[PDB]
Amino acid sequence: SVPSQKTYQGSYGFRLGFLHSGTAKSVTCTYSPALNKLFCQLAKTCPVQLWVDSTPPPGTRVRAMAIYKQSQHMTEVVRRCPHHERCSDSDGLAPPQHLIRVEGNLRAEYLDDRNTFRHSVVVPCEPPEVGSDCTTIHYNYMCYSSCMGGMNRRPILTIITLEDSSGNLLGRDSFEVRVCACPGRDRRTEEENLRKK
Ligand SMILES: C=CCOc1cc(C(=O)O)c(O)c(I)c1-n1cccc1
Numbered sequence: 276s277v278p279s280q281k282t283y284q285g286s287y288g289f290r291l292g293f294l295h296s297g298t299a300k301s302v303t304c305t306y307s308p309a310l311n312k313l314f315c316q317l318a319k320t321c322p323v324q325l326w327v328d329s330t331p332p333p334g335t336r337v338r339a340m341a342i343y344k345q346s347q348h349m350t351e352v353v354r355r356c357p358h359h360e361r362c363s364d365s366d367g368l369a370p371p372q373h374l375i376r377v378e379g380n381l382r383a384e385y386l387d388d389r390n391t392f393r394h395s396v397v398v399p400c401e402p403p404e405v406g407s408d409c410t411t412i413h414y415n416y417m418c419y420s421s422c423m424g425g426m427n428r429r430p431i432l433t434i435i436t437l438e439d440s441s442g443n444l445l446g447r448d449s450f451e452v453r454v455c456a457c458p459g460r461d462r463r464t465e466e467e468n469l470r471k472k
């Protein structure tokens with residue numbers, strides 16, 4: 276099977292937001308609205324904002340999962356490559372096979388789905404801090420898009436779902452991801468390729 280990627284704001288008006296980090300050579304994470312695509316370096320902080328129009332109930336959670344973007348690969352589980360799954364870079368909580376980690380949240384839970392074998396990471400919703408209007412989750416991507424025997428240059432999407440306490444769907448959003456050495460240059464190149472076309 277294949278997880279849905281349909282954008283769904285749901286009853287709470289759920290959607291993502293991204294910072295405006297620019298495309299300088301030194302940037303470590305940068306989001307392209309024109310491409311709906313995040314470009315980031317390996318194992319660097321990726322801030323993803325969560326926005327709602329109304330407060331979801333206590334016990335609501337936010338899950339992240341990666342799938343391959345191309346239809347001919349969508350049934351394959353996205354996982355870390357044979358090198359990175361063995362490199363002993365564990366944070367004590369994420370299984371070494373998982374591509375997506377949450378940084379700095381001891382309540383993150385990592386799921387290996389017993390039926391689909393897909394990986395995901397889920398955290399409890401927490402309201403914005405005083406003086407803020409949204410909540411931010413910090414994700415890390417633990418393989419390059421190019422890693423041989425893993426993503427192997429195939430594009431991926433990240434699907435972010437807002438879920439109730441039983442795991443039922445409340446909202447969904449998504450974005451493409453490229454994990455690469457020079458996200459600023461790659462964002463500029465791909466936005467130029469989208470122009471021209
Ligand atoms: C159960 C926890 C309440 O979750 C929120 C409350 C508010 C609020 O304004 O009351 C909000 O703005 C946000 I964004 C969240 N939220 C956190 C992650 C996804 C949504």
Ligand SMILES: [Zn+2]
Binds near residue numbers: 355358423
């Ligand atoms: Zn790798």
